[PDB]
Design brief:
The structure is a homodimer. Chain A is of the alpha/beta class. In chain A, 39% of the residues lie in helices and 18% in strands. The first copy, chain A, has two domains: 44 residues, Single alpha-helices involved in coiled-coils or other helix-helix interfaces, CATH 1.20.5; 142 residues, Stimulator of interferon genes protein (Rossmann fold, 3-Layer(aba) Sandwich). Chain A has a five-stranded mixed sheet. Chains A and B meet through helix 1 and helix 4 of A and helix 1 and helix 4 of B. Chains A, B: It is found in: Endoplasmic reticulum membrane; Cytoplasm, Perinuclear region; Endoplasmic reticulum-Golgi intermediate compartment membrane; Golgi apparatus membrane. Chains A, B: Belongs to the STING family.
């Protein structure tokens, strides 16, 4: 009905990023696990885990968001700029999920960048954007994003959305646990 | 009413790019004209000219779109990553507008990137996006973009939108002339 900025954000994210990165994602993780060391087999997960914090807060470093999340390595490149699409290549990060001072899991992990736009709008007066407005568009962003992936060809299979909202007060939340739950699940 | 992907695209473009680049645009052009050579005064225009082709076609190189548009130089950097915003710095291009094999004008010039998303959607089956759909969203993108700039603080003053549509057949159009008209105008 109204403006609904989320719809545009979701499509740009998929068309301009997800669809270009996802196809070769499995291969780049295979390279890290099997072809970057002859003494050990890597155990990096097979999917791109996309953090979708409804509050749209996106820290520069994951560890600060949670100490139990630690940067491990850069996802190896392919490498091919001219495969057709061009934007390639892209920088991606592998993280180890700590639990009891012990590595519980490992995976390529990142926030949904468009949420920065959402966050920035709410902090921009001319936008007339409130907290609830941000939440509304954030939820919407996820809904339309997963709607897109469903119609996608296996792109949904190389990818998983981790949407979550933290309580406002007396808030006990563990990002790593949230991710782990997802990793562990399969 | 409906999805209207343009609204999101316009806001992301302004919030994530225009608003970060525009503020220091005047200074970077002042640097090129006055502080990059002690033998001559540069004559680069004072505004960022944004190409808004309604057909959403965005060539890698401007000259191919028109031979009379020639890359001249990179817009000098500031340079400051941590001014608050971070994405900075950004690469920008200065172009000379030829006319009769003679330089008629010179300015920092670039396409509105989000139009690539529009173009890409129309070429994506699952989107259910037609030519007219692309045009509709393209026009909409410009409308909401200029709506944003109007409420902006002088950002509109350091910037100018060049929206244009080319005829389908027997099409005689000169991009350089279009830009020049704009430059000349002031």
């Amino acid at each position: 009905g109204n403006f609904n900025v989320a719809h545009g954000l979701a499509w740009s994210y998929y068309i301009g990023y997800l669809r270009l990165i996802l196809p070769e994602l499995q291969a780049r993780i295979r390279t890290y696990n099997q072809h970057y060391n002859n003494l050990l087999r890597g155990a990096v997960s097979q999917r791109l885990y996309i953090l979708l914090p409804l509050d749209c807060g996106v820290p520069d470093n994951l560890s600060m968001a949670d100490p139990n999340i630690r940067f491990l390595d850069k996802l190896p490149q392919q490498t091919a700029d001219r495969a057709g699409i061009k934007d390639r290549v892209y920088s991606n990060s592998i993280y180890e999920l700590l639990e009891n001072g012990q590595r519980a899991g490992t995976c390529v992990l990142e926030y949904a960048t468009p949420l920065q736009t959402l966050f920035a709008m709410s902090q921009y007066s001319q936008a007339g954007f409130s907290r609830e407005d941000r939440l509304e568009q954030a939820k919407l962003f996820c809904r339309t994003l997963e709607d897109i992936l469903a119609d996608a060809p296996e792109s949904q299979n190389n990818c998983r959305l981790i949407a979550y909202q933290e309580p406002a007060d007396d808030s006990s939340f563990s990002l790593s646990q949230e991710v782990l739950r997802h990793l562990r699940q399969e």
